[PDB]
Design a protein around this ligand. Structure first.
Ligand SMILES: Nc1nc2c(ncn2[C@@H]2O[C@@H]3COP(=O)(O)O[C@H]4[C@@H](O)[C@H](n5cnc6c(=O)[nH]c(N)nc65)O[C@@H]4COP(=O)(O)O[C@H]3[C@H]2O)c(=O)[nH]1
Length: 264
């Protein structure tokens, strides 16, 4: 039996957190992370070899989801560095792909801490260059919600990165007037619609209208629209009908290690 010792119990919990933090740092130093890729399919007549990068942690025989560790990472201020890790390895992948004759584009996540992170812009500027990758091959997405609360930094990031010809866009993009207003202050290259809008597109009037409210503004503004978690054929068709440019999700193609999707 283990006799209850509150000080020892709190120590053990912080030891569990500390192990995770230490494992995340070891992963950063030792290349313990890995990217998987999900094909993103163009629906509007402009095939493009595009994948989204998804982060995994290769921990002692387990391919772990960020669901395991991102909360710890956020609490311990490791997200900034993890996002830079991802961006750097994404550019490396873009370079290796290009050298192998593939005009691969990657869509990569960055959080708001990255907007003001000089090392993020340095990583993009320097790694594109060293791999001879045109900036247009790298698309960066950040949640709309984070741009609202870091607008000036987001705008500075957008400008800094756009200067490389990278695309900066918003994920979890909504259909409220606040979203329409944000587009007057922040010009993204692309919008990825929030799943709350898109999930029931095949069956829901209101979702169909939300999407057309967005695409009707996005299209003439030269903003690409995207939907995710596309899970069936009816949904995919509905996005095509609504003028959405891109779709992704397990029905299109599951996430995986390989870039083997035939885009044509
Ligand atoms: N977004 C998206 N996901 C799809 C889709 N179809 C299937 N999935 C799977 O569903 C999970 C959705 O998580 P999320 O909301 O993107 O939430 C993500 C996100 O919060 C975080 N995450 C994943 N990859 C990255 C990354 O590269 N960078 C950062 N900062 N966070 C990441 O970890 C969470 C879990 O990711 P996973 O284990 O990869 O698990 C992902 C993904 O593998 C799709 O169409 N779109």
């Amino acid at each position: 039996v283990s006799i209850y010792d509150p000080a020892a119990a709190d120590r053990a919990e912080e030891e569990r957190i500390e192990r995770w933090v230490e494992q995340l740092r070891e992963a950063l130093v030792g290349d313990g992370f890995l990217l998987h890729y999900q094909p993103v399919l163009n629906l509007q007549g402009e095939p493009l070899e595009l994948y989204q990068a998804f982060l995994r942690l290769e921990r002692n025989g387990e391919m772990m989801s960020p669901n395991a560790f991102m909360a710890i990472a956020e609490e311990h201020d490791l997200v900034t560095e993890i996002d830079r890790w991802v961006v750097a390895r994404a550019i490396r992948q873009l370079g290796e792909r290009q050298r192998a004759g593939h005009k691969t584009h990657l869509l990569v996540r960055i959080g708001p801490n990255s907007f003001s992170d000089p090392q993020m812009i340095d990583t993009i500027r320097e790694q594109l260059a060293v791999y001879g990758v045109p900036g247009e091959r790298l698309w960066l997405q950040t949640p709309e919600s984070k741009v609202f609360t870091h607008l000036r930094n987001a705008q500075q990031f957008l400008a800094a990165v756009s200067a490389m010809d990278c695309k900066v866009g918003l994920e979890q993009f909504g259909s409220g007037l606040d979203s329409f207003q944000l587009l007057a202050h922040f010009h993204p290259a692309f919008l990825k619609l929030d799943r709350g809008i898109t999930g029931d597109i095949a069956s829901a009037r209101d979702s169909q209208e939300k999407i057309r409210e967005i695409t009707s503004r996005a299209q003439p503004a030269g903003i690409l629209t995207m939907a995710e978690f596309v899970a069936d054929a009816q949904s995919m068709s509905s996005f095509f009908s609504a003028g959405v440019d891109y779709v992704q999700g397990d029905f299109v193609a599951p996430t995986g290690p390989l870039m083997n999707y035939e885009f044509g």
